[PDB]
Ligand binder design. Sequence first.
Ligand SMILES: [Mg+2]
Ligand SMILES: [Mg+2]
Ligand SMILES: [Mg+2]
Ligand SMILES: [Mg+2]
Ligand SMILES: [Mg+2]
Ligand SMILES: [Mg+2]
Ligand SMILES: [Mg+2]
Ligand SMILES: [Mg+2]
Ligand SMILES: [Mg+2]
Ligand SMILES: [Mg+2]
Ligand SMILES: [Mg+2]
Ligand SMILES: [Mg+2]
Lengths: 143, 55, 141, 145, 106, 117, 78, 58
Amino acid sequence: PGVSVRDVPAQDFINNYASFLQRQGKLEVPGYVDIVKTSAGNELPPQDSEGWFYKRAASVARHIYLRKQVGVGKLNKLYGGAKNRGVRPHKHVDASGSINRKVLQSLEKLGVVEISPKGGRRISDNGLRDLDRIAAATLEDEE
Amino acid sequence: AHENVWYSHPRKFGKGSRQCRISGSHSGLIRKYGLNIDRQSFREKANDIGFYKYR
Amino acid sequence: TVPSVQTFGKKKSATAVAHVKAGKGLIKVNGSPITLVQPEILRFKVYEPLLLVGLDKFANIDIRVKVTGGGHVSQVYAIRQAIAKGLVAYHQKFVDEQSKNELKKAFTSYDRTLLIADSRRPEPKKFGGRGARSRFQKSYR
Amino acid sequence: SLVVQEQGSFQHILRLLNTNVDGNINVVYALTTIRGVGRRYANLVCKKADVDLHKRAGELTQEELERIVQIMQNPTHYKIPAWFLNRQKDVNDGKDYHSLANNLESKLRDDLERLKKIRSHRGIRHFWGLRVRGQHTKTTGRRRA
Amino acid sequence: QEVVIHKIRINLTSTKVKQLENVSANIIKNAETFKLVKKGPVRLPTKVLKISTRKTPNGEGSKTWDTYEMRIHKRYIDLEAPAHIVKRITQITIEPGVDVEVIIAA
Amino acid sequence: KTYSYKGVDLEKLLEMPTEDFVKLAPARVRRKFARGLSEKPAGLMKKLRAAKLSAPENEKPAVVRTHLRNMIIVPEMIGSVVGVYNGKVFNQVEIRPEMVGHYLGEFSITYTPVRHG
Amino acid sequence: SKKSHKDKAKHAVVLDQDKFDRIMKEAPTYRYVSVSVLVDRFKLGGSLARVALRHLENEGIIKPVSKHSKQAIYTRAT
Amino acid sequence: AIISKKRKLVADGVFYAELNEFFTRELAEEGYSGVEVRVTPTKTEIIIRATKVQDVVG
RNA sequence: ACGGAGCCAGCGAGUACAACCUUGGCCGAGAGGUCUGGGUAAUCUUGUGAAACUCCGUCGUGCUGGGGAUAGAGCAUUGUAAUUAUUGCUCUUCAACGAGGAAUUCCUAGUAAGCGCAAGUCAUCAGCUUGCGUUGAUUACGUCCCUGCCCUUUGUACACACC
Ligand SMILES: [Mg+2]
Ligand SMILES: [Mg+2]
Ligand SMILES: [Mg+2]
Ligand SMILES: [Mg+2]
Ligand SMILES: [Mg+2]
Ligand SMILES: [Mg+2]
Ligand SMILES: [Mg+2]
Ligand SMILES: [Mg+2]
Ligand SMILES: [Mg+2]
Ligand SMILES: [Mg+2]
Ligand SMILES: [Mg+2]
Ligand SMILES: [Mg+2]
């Protein structure tokens, strides 16, 4: 029967959506990738030098599908963990804002994310349709 | 006491910008909810204010 | 109206509200099926009522659980207790007495918390120490 | 998945910018062993040079070394930003450079002797060997060793 | 000619309970007496106004603190009710301590 | 090289306005001068220009004493001798071309060095 | 700041042909295979321990019992 | 006058402290006992409980 | 340890005769900047999408990708004013540190411990304190041996009382 993103494991669905977005030539990566920490909390760029932006976009799209609507600051709160503040106690450091802004604009160009009246951005019918389609892809991929 | 120089230093903020409202002191001040009463006078007048020892 | 009731299960600060209806064997938590509980290694904890009772006991019964508050494992135990209590309450309300008593015998003979909420809750902290019931340190010199 | 790695060509020692570097370490962390180059800067230099990140420094070829070397002396040519550079705005001539193994320590020494000569408080504190950035010294750094 | 319902709202505050509950009960009884439709005295989380304070005025002595506090109870009420009787209710049955506030919201 | 500050040569350093140095100066100076200026540094500049003018062109100009430590040394200030308040003494300092960018406070050591034993 | 251990390189940072015939020869006869077990015999550095360990899942030389991260559990194929 | 309700109650308490201490300072010769602050829709009544009521009135 | 991905709280607090909590949209790599919109508060920040934690990879016993002290340069914020680095951010040097002697501290269940968040200091600043919640144990369930405490009996040349 029909299948939503809630019926598929998070990590596998996100990996498959990243792979599918990477395979097709859409979802342009900003020219400043390979450069950025992705947050003040981190101290190195992603280990996967190329393709990590697709993973982040997949995670963002799944997050907007699951939740009500999400802006950029909320994603900054979501991503980013604890900064090793040298010899001081760790705290919570918000993620980089430019990366998430570019992710949301790229998702807008792909048509998967729509601007919501209540502020932030919500899921769009076409994009959520592709999300269910690739959730089915992963689910019948499992067995 | 030239008016240009007397009390000329700004006092918009910091330790001495606000006083105790009881004693005029600048130490041990309680700014919570706009009390602006220092701790000892707060301990004295808490019951009159509405604050009680409860748990 | 559809025979359906609502129960709940709590942990330290977790709370799972479970609606039980006469369905088709449909068990979802937070809109996701039980097989994908937030963690992974306490998954058997949340299957535990299923396997202790036997799935065929509730094959035409559907489960919807919304779990909020508390950390991961507290939420998991909340879903555990919520599902167990929902099954027991539904069987009491609409099925039969002996069925509910047999479910309670299968449950309470195993991890009593399955039907009884845990009594332990955090101890308030006190001045003179960084812990709820610990002191800072002494110097003596 | 795995390769024999062509016995007889895998280098074990290298001399990039007149410092001996062991080649068996991962490329980025092997480059990290030269003064003025850290894990972040070496990682970015390796990324721009297109050499494999998970490769071993003792197994990449010679023109790879010279291309990496060329990238990591004039970074601004290869789209390394104005920031992320070691010494930016360069208060001798205003051109954002990046100091390296000998150059880093040497130029730090000229900056130190400039601060000594300028008779700045920071300079005389440096000349004395005391803490500079304004830390308490009653209990901090009470042992030379 | 004030037949237009103002969908008025009555909210309360206090640092005490019995007087506030008494005022709310009198308000509800008055509303029922004149056949008024209402949403009941909905309870609001008692906001605990807390200050921690060191006991020693001079710092000397074993570290001992204390916590003073009040609670504020709100219990707002809204009425889909006529004009004059509602206002007359607001200007009557007032107890010191409990504070009454009225919002027309029409 | 003899001296360049940030690519601007010493010869250009003597004859050059404050604002160009602000654009050349680091971020802290940029914010300080962009945040508005007190009248006291302007008066110090006026007095120091007068002192430079007064000197018969071939000796070290007369020392100008000042309590101000929070303002910095602009290119117009070079060639000048100022006594920066130290708490007691208006400590002497001649303003060299490498003064620039810094404050005066770096050259009036508010504490005496500590010697043990 | 000590010097007590006095450890050598003690690890094949790069695999060699003779070492390849080795890893393949006792790819069986090692009734339990893991990263630490593989490097215990001095023939693997530890990063390529995972490389050769994942490579053996090519023609069913060994079987997986659990594939959790941070380690691996493999038995000889029977 | 718009202000947070918790802050408004705190201000009411500190105002009562104001009044009580001021009356203690002033009516001390009157055998001052206490003060009650009642708030009506229009008037802020201030009842003074003291011994020498007729002298307090003056 | 480091990369991604999962995504879970409870105490709070928050602007008026002042300028607080900040969502959201654009910029910047980040700190941050700007434009708007909510919230005098179960309404908005806020479900405070917090860390530890979980899954998949890189690392592989090397003072090493641990440790981040000490410094060099630059970018911003608060501030009349930041040098004697306020604080935040970016690149680099990366020190001592190998589970720490005598000795000594706290603690018997949501306890200790790990982990963070809020509030008080606050124009800016915590490694502090007061509270709160997450994950959550080993070992007692006894004794007067050390340190003391309570009652009784006894002795005293002590009563500023075994200092
Ligand atoms: Mg994360
Ligand atoms: Mg992690
Ligand atoms: Mg750490
Ligand atoms: Mg604790
Ligand atoms: Mg590290
Ligand atoms: Mg919450
Ligand atoms: Mg988080
Ligand atoms: Mg290191
Ligand atoms: Mg303190
Ligand atoms: Mg005991
Ligand atoms: Mg005697
Ligand atoms: Mg004696």
